[PDB]
Write a structure and sequence with these properties.
Bound molecules: the ligand CSc1ccccc1CC(=O)N1CCO[C@H](C(N)=O)C1, zinc ion
Order of helices and strands: EHEEEEEEEEE
Number of helices: 1
Shape: globular
Subunit structure: Homodimer.
Largest sheet: 7 strands, antiparallel
Catalytic activity: Selective cleavage of Tyr-|-Gly bond in the picornavirus polyprotein
Protein name: Protease 2A
C-alpha cells in the first residue's frame, strides 16, 4: 500500500483505490494502474520532472529502501492477476529488485522528487508506474 500526496491530489494504484477515492475522482487510467483523487488537505510531495534512470524505492515486504537502475516508461505485458486480465500496461518502468503484491504504492524517488509508485513485480523484478509526465499534478 502507499500513496503520493501533491497539492490537493492523492495518487494511488488504481487496483488499490478505496471506496472514498472513487467518490472523489479527478482522473484514472486502467492501462497505467493509476487513480488520482482530490484531498481536503494540501500534500507535500514534489513530483520529479526529469529523465533520471537511477533512484531509491521503498520495499514494504523488507522494511527497506533500495537503490535501483530502472528502464524508461514503456508498454509492458503484465500477466493476469485478481485485479486485471492479461494486458499491456503503459508508462511502466522495470528494475531488478525484490517486490511482492503488498508492495504496490511504495514510492520511487530520484534527486528531483517522486518518479512513481510500485505497480508490478515478480521473478526478482519490480515495476513502477511513472507519474513524471502528469504535469497537471503541479497545478490547480
Ligand atoms: C509488486 S506487485 C507483485 C510482486 C510480485 C509478484 C506479483 C505481483 C503482483 C502484480 O504484479 N500485479 C498484481 C496487481 O496488479 C498489478 C498491475 N499493475 O497490473 C500486477
Ligand atoms: Zn530525476
Amino acid at each position: 500500500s502507499g500513496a503520493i500526496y501533491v497539492g490537493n491530489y492523492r495518487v494511488v494504484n488504481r487496483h488499490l483505490a478505496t471506496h472514498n477515492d472513487w467518490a472523489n475522482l479527478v482522473w484514472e487510467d486502467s492501462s497505467r494502474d493509476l487513480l488520482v483523487s482530490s484531498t481536503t488537505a494540501q500534500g507535500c510531495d514534489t513530483i520529479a520532472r526529469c529523465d533520471c534512470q537511477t533512484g531509491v524505492y521503498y520495499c514494504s515486504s523488507r522494511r527497506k529502501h533500495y537503490p535501483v537502475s530502472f528502464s524508461k516508461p514503456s508498454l509492458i505485458f503484465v500477466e493476469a492477476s485478481e485485479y486485471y486480465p492479461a494486458r499491456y500496461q503503459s508508462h511502466l518502468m522495470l528494475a531488478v529488485g525484490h517486490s511482492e503484491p503488498g508492495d504496490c504504492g511504495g514510492i520511487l524517488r530520484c534527486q528531483h522528487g517522486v518518479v512513481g509508485i510500485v505497480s508490478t513485480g515478480g521473478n526478482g523484478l519490480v515495476g513502477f508506474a511513472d507519474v513524471r509526465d502528469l504535469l497537471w499534478l503541479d497545478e490547480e
